[PDB]
């Protein structure tokens, strides 16, 4: 009656990870730089479960996940669903590699979060940005996404359709597919992907969204690695306007025994709406982080950032569009801890 | 130090579910048709976690559970906590039964949700209706319940009484209790049960409800099985109204090898209130479903079905009585799969 | 490939917790009384997540903890989240005892709950008093936290830092900072303890809190056993205004074979303000209880508990400062379990 590993449906892993963050804004308010600012906890741990399963009567294999939130992030109160985060079913096949539905990450997505959004570049890179409409959904409800293999070892395909936000909840059409390629080539990896959102109601109007993206990732056999990307988003709204808007990360990295040194920027460059360009719509960042590589499972890391942040815009209903500079200009000192089980 | 089943003092469970399901509606506007309308995934998937304990000062078993919602419903926000589906502590005999409190369904639910919502039948049976106060309570917090042993392996009683919505956040002084039996006799089941609640407010009154139910469910030897319920429901309120309204539901299933055809239909006809009937108070919905048995634990289906709600009433109160039409007539084209472990 | 308890870098432990209580209100007004009033359940179970982690590049031995919240408490609707208990990362060294980071107890607080708030007497004594600012925060998220080794066996310390209820969500300044000691003295304990808050916003003024505690916990060898705890708040207004109040809560048992007697007595003193004791503004509660120790793991239990609160007062905006008391006095009998695995 001895359990072994195989007697379980299922399996509990989880991140935990916290990050003790200390900021300070230059908001132009000085109450709202001490709101803002201060010391917090930035609780990022998560629970997850996961299994397989092979059916009887159906060759390609049963897979599921079902994965809580963060506990406590900082600017946050406590407490975390199950489900928050990567939360789907799915079938795998050693042929045609893998197709997922329910709660994914976009395949653009994927590749602004990793690498292009470390460390700390996600206010510019993530969900920055001064565009109309919907640049590009995140982790995402409602998504049928596909997995290709590696076919040849070199190259392999990411696919995706969903429904929109407000879709997830029968408040309207919106709807997005998208599109990720990759390919090995000597040390490097070269990255492409797309992504279109249809019907998003934003600003008293509909936008359709198109946004793409190219980049690269490099291999030194010295511990030196780097990656730069590129990002053009467009949008274009009902009552005709047009509005552009490019991007770029970079980041470096020297991998040395038990360290990591890493240094990484990032900017979202002046918006354009019907070809006029837009003055001081533009964001960045610049990043420096130590990480040690404390065992085979964890990291520990300090970190270092300052994020410049546009001065403001008005979005088509003659109203502030928010933006992730909206609460202001801040620098962020962190260490940090995460263990993988 | 090697592990047994009796290790652990908890087991995790789990019902893997995920439909995905396009729905047509017909409301009379467009707009709310696109909203409500097109393809969503539904994960209804979610985690539990229970045990037994046989206590060394205590005979009748101690028992509990506490189990998740649905992770990512369609309509709904992702995340969902431990505890919002059967909830409870309890303690079991062989000689009596057992008995539980917590959170669970009323002895009437548990029947009207199956067999008789099954599939797809559920806006019309479960919820559906357009009767004041409260039909009955359906999984219900602050709830003590008795499910007796199967007497004579032909007969059994599920019983039970609980606080109501509002007295389970002191809002008030709301209360039910309710009653069912089941008798096997051949190939069949009998089911009877009733469900009274008391000091419901609702329309600027106090109501009274009580509603009876009966029905039958079939097993021929060469796959074939049914079932019918009907179920009348009364209420009266504090200013002197009465509303009566019945209801009925069916289904025909042909199971051969690894698959199950079904057929199923169900209906609340006219409400009456003081005796006169309300034109075009009355549901249906008829919805078709082949569902294979892809392995021991888990299947594969497909379903159509077709509800047409009401066409509206007022309250008490002279205002539109929300009902489960409110949102409009609607079709709806589903494929699933559903895992238990 | 048998498993062990080692294969696991997880444990899920839980509080099986279920309190069948009945209140009576007496508020003054009926209605409210049948509101609040009446029988309800109190789900307080939980579950949680927990592991240690030598990491091979650093000696002091990791920690971390992840606990869901009661799920199906009374005056509350279903469902918990993970995180929203005692929810930490730390470390751990024979030397210099443990530090977690996250969601703890304050060192105050630890001793407020525990042994005083029990049984039942946390309305007057946990959350409970009249005063102005935050007395002192109880679990909260944000904070660093030091638990000393027993030095000696006889002595130790629990030192703490945290952020703010409003700087949690980037929304304030307020912060606080507590210390608590132990000393064991054959069979006495003596606990002290004190917590300072900063930059705490209400009624329209900054605030500044300091709260300092002493108490005494004594074992017989008949089984019998009692605490006593004295309590002492100041609070200071950025307008200049000064309050004090003091309280105390007192605990009598007696435990003989299988069973457990418990009288426990608390109460908050009539508030003063820039010297003037304000009228009616002091609580207190009775309680007596019986309890089986029906397993090693488990309780059963018998209480009843009367609480009379104070009859209002203003705070320093002119306006109602909401206490414990603001829904009226009332008297509650509860039966109840708990099992711990
Ligand atoms: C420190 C380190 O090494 N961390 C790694 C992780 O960071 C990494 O995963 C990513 O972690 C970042 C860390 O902050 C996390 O950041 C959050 O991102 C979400 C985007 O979904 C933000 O949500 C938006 O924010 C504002 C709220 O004010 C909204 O207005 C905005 O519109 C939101 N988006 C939408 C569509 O509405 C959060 O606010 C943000 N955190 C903040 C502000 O503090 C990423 O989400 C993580 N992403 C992923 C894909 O995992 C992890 C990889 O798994 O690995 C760690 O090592
Ligand atoms: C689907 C299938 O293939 N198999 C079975 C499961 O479905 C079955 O459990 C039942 O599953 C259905 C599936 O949709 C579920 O439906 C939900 O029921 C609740 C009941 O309270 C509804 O709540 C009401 O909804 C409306 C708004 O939508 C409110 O206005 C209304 O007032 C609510 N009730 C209140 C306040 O009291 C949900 O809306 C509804 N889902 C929707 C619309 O998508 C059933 O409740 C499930 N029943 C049970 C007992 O769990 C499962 C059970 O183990 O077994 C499979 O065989
Ligand atoms: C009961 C028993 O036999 N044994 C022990 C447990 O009880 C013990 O933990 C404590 O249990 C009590 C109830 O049994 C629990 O009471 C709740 O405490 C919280 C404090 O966070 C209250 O929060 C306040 O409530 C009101 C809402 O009306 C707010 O207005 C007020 O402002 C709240 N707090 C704040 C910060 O704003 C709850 O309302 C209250 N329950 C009620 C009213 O029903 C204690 O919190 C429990 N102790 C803890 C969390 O440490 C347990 C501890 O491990 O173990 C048993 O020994």
Redesign the interface.
Known sequence: ???????F??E?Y?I?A?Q?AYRDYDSGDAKQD????????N?E???G?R?K?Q????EPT?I?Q?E??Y??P???????????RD???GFESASWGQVR???VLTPMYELVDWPASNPGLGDVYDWGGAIGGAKYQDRQ????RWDSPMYADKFSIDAAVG?GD????????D?WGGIAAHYKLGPLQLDAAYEGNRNIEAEGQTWENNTYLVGVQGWFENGISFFAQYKYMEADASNGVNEKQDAMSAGLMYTTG?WQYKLGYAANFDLERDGKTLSNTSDDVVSAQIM???????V?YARARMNDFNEGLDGLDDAARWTSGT?GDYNEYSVG?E?Y?
């Open positions: 009656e001895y359990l072994t590993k195989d007697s449906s299922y509990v989880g935990i916290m003790a001490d709101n803002l600012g201060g010391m917090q906890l609780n741990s998560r629970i479960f299994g399963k059916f009887a009567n159906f049963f599921w079902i809580g939130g506990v406590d900082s600017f946050g109160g406590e407490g975390a669903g199950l489900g928050e939360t789907f079913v539905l329910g709660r409800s409602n998504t049928i429904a407000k879709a997830g909840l029968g408040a309207g059409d709807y038990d040690y590589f404390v065992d085979p499972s964890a520990l609460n801890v263990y089980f």
